[PDB]
């Protein structure tokens, strides 16, 4: 069945079909309205429930199979005054001393040792990006009706790992996390990806540095594909696209290289609902022929009224990882725009140069080449990350 | 199977047969004159030489391999003595290695000596005559291992002797070799 379950606890799940999985949610939620994108009433203190009583008591009596007076009793009984140890207005910035929590004692040990001139600051907590992604998008609705999430829509969370693996650490991962819609297609996720590999450029231009190539790799090549459950999904919307799946298969299935038989679909063939997939299992996306991305589905769920409902922001970026810039070797403070080989001036080969440093060191007042070296323009993936 | 590419051996394992067989000759010729061939199963010598020759042709590519790891690629089952021959031959070649100062400077050992056999093979006839302590017409002993372990004493004259065989015999020794009737009954019970 398309019934989720762990294969490895808290690490990956057993496979299920996305569309049937969404319908399994909605078979338990459709008509009930809990999946709706419309604002419901909420709790309050028992002293101000009078206005909501006329609407709440009857429904509570219906659902709990009790009387109206029993519903009113339960409503006043379960008021938030029984739980609000914090008054409405107390700030979170200070630990309330009127507590017995072990958690708040440990928090006391965290905070008190920072209260010194060497450590007093309001800097980052552990990481920066996530709440910025939430706050700018959460609870918003679109300006266009065509960019409005359907009620009960499946919301997927996909981690796209960077091609630059840390290669000294394997526990934590370099990635940016992306939300996609069940009804949407792979085309939209591929188009939304801003990866630096599309910006790849080259060519040797030590003699004429200003004749840097006019075309980025995106203008020269457009091949890209996802891969799930043994199926490649290759783009063929443009003449710069090539179905890489054929060549991969033609070599991989020639021997018992350790992988199963694969099949070929196009990128535009599948919506995210059409997949049969596992959560947490490593999958593959590749583009520009060489930039392989490890794809991990980290969450999938129905939409809710508190979510970001503005599809102009979708596919929605929700997390990112912070690569370092390639600073020039000359000044060591500034990111390089050039890289040189066989350089008679540089102490090492290769050597990275910022635009200014490159130009003064290797050229005279008229731009004439000085010394022996080869030069290449450089776009920094540690900057364009 | 090293002479062509195959899904089991990519090119970095592929090699030219002529070079390998030549190298093995230049090693086996050392083996015999260094007494290693005589009185042993001959094949382990070939296996050891081929393994190391194949490595030394591309040491940067091939130093990471092993006996069985190499052989099972060729679907070859290897001698267990090949380990003995290997240890023996590395012991020999380091003793050649010290003879040359421009090899001596690198402080060669088990790991590193392999990638210089191409260097040593050019001058091996000088290395042996600079290395052996047996400089006689007919510092290292050029002898088979059977006494490279050295005698505990160099075979002093044996005690060839005779005795008086005609003496009387102590009957007590004879009666010690006899079971008493109590012991006879014990064995009968045990049987």
């Amino acid at each position: 069945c398309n019934f989720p379950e762990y294969e490895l606890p808290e690490l990956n799940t057993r496979a299920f079909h996305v569309g049937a999985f969404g319908e399994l949610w909605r078979g338990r939620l459709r008509g009930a309205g809990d999946l709706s994108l419309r604002e419901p009433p909420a709790s309050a203190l028992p002293g101000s429930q009078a206005a909501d009583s006329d609407r709440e008591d009857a429904a509570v009596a219906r659902d709990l199979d009790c009387s109206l007076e029993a519903a009113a009793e339960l409503r006043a009984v379960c008021g938030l005054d029984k739980l609000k140890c914090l008054e409405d207005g107390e700030d979170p910035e200070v630990i309330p001393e009127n507590t017995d929590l072990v958690t708040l004692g440990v928090r006391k040990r965290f905070l008190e040792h920072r209260e010194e001139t060497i450590t007093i600051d309001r800097a980052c907590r552990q990481e920066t990006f996530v709440y910025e992604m939430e706050s700018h998008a959460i609870g918003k609705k679109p300006e266009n009706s065509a960019d409005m999430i359907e009620e009960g829509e499946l919301i997927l969370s996909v981690n796209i790992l960077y091609p630059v693996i840390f290669h000294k650490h394997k526990e934590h991962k370099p990635y940016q996390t992306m939300l996609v819609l069940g009804s949407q297609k792979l085309t939209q996720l591929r188009d939304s990806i801003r990866c630096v590999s599309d910006l790849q450029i080259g060519g040797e231009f030590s003699n004429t540095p200003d004749q840097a190539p006019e075309h980025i790799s995106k203008d020269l090549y457009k091949s890209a594909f996802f891969y799930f459950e043994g199926t490649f999904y290759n783009d063929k919307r443009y003449p710069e696209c090539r179905d890489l799946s054929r060549t991969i298969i033609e070599w991989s299935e020639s021997h018992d290289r350790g992988y199963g038989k694969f099949q070929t679909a196009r990128m535009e063939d599948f919506t995210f609902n059409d997949l049969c997939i596992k959560l947490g299992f490593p999958y593959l996306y590749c583009h520009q022929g060489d930039c392989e991305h490890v794809i991990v589905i980290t969450d999938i769920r129905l939409v809710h009224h508190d979510d970001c409902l503005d599809r102009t922001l979708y596919p929605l970026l929700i997390k990112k990882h912070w690569l370092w810039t390639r600073k020039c070797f000359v000044c060591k403070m500034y990111t390089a725009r050039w890289v040189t080989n066989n350089d008679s001036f540089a102490p090492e080969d290769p050597c990275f140069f910022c635009d200014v440093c490159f130009r003064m060191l290797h050229y005279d007042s008229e731009g004439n080449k000085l010394g022996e070296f080869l030069a290449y323009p450089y776009v920094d993936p540690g900057t364009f990350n | 199977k090293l002479f062509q590419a195959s899904p089991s051996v990519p090119a970095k394992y592929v090699e030219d047969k002529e070079k390998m067989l030549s190298r093995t000759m230049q090693l086996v010729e050392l083996a015999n004159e260094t007494w290693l061939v005589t009185g042993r199963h001959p094949l382990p010598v070939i296996t050891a030489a081929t393994f190391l020759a194949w490595q030394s042709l591309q040491p940067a590519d091939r130093l990471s391999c092993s006996l069985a790891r190499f052989c099972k690629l060729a679907n070859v089952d290897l001698p267990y003595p090949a380990s003995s021959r290997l240890q023996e031959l590395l012991a020999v070649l380091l003793r050649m290695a010290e003879q040359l100062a421009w090899l001596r400077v690198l402080r060669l050992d088990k790991r590193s000596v392999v990638k210089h056999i191409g260097d040593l093979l050019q001058h091996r006839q000088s290395l042996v005559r600079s290395a052996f302590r047996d400089g006689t017409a007919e510092p290292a002993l050029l002898l088979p291992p059977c006494m490279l372990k050295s005698p505990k004493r160099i075979c002093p004259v044996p005690p060839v002797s005779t005795v008086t065989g005609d003496e009387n015999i102590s009957d007590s020794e004879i009666e010690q070799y006899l079971r008493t009737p109590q012991e006879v009954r014990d064995f009968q019970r045990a049987q």
């Binding site: 090549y221 350089d343 | 100062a101």
Partner: protein, 242 residues
């Protein structure tokens, strides 16, 4: 689960991936570099010591091996000739070699190193002594431009700093080989430019200008989300920053 790290496909018997595709081959033809080419590792001290060891061994071998070739060819010829006087003359040449090996072995390390621009076997060093871990030309640059003892490795003096800053203007802060040569302290153009740019006021900024403000505002408006911006990645576009 970390086994699926790049390459996502890796063969189980040899570890190799799929062969080169059309797009990658055309990119290589066009000279478009791969991001794996950007990985550079630091020279740790034993690497430099091993480099000096390799260079001195290369020089020692370049010296001795022709000598020993002469010696052994002489000995081979001697082993077959029957004329006694010719035998003794060949022996005399063998004695020449026998003396010379002892003398050259007694040479010190610096004399073995010789001059900065002498001929050394970068290829063999790279793929045998360094096993290909560092390429031949990388080793060549490192040695000949930083590691050979003839390179000025000393700290910058106040007079050197001031004369650098003064004579840099005479060449327009360009053509830094000429600046290094005019400095007279055997500095390299790269060394002079590095020392200049780590203090040059024109590069490192306490100031602000209109185009820097314009593009800083544009990138902030483009890329900021709430409180976060990529502070030190905006450096690539507005110059002189860190």
């Amino acid at each position: 689960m970390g086994h699926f790290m790049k390459p996502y496909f890796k063969d189980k018997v040899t570890g190799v991936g799929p062969p080169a595709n059309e797009d990658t081959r055309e990119k290589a033809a066009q000279g478009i570099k791969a991001f794996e080419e950007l990985l550079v590792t630091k020279w740790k001290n034993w690497e430099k010591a091993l480099l000096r060891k390799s260079v001195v061994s290369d020089r020692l071998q370049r010296l001795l091996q022709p000598k020993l070739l002469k010696l052994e060819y002489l000995h081979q010829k001697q082993s077959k000739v029957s004329s006694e006087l010719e035998r003794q003359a060949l022996e005399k040449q063998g004695r020449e070699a026998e003396k010379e090996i002892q003398d050259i072995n007694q040479l010190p390390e610096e004399a073995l190193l010789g001059n900065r621009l002498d001929s050394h076997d970068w290829e063999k060093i790279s793929n045998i002594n360094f096993e290909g871990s560092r390429s031949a030309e990388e080793i060549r640059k490192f040695w000949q431009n930083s590691e050979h003892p003839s390179i000025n490795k000393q700290e910058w003096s106040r007079e050197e700093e001031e004369r650098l800053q003064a004579i840099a203007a005479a060449h327009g802060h360009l053509e830094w080989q000429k600046i290094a040569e005019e400095l007279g302290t055997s500095r390299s153009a790269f060394q002079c430019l590095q020392k200049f740019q780590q203090h040059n006021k024109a590069l490192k900024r306490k100031e602000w200008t209109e185009e820097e403000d314009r593009m800083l505002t544009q990138l902030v408006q483009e890329m900021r989300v709430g409180s976060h911006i990529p502070y030190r990645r905006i450096v690539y576009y507005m110059e002189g920053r860190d």
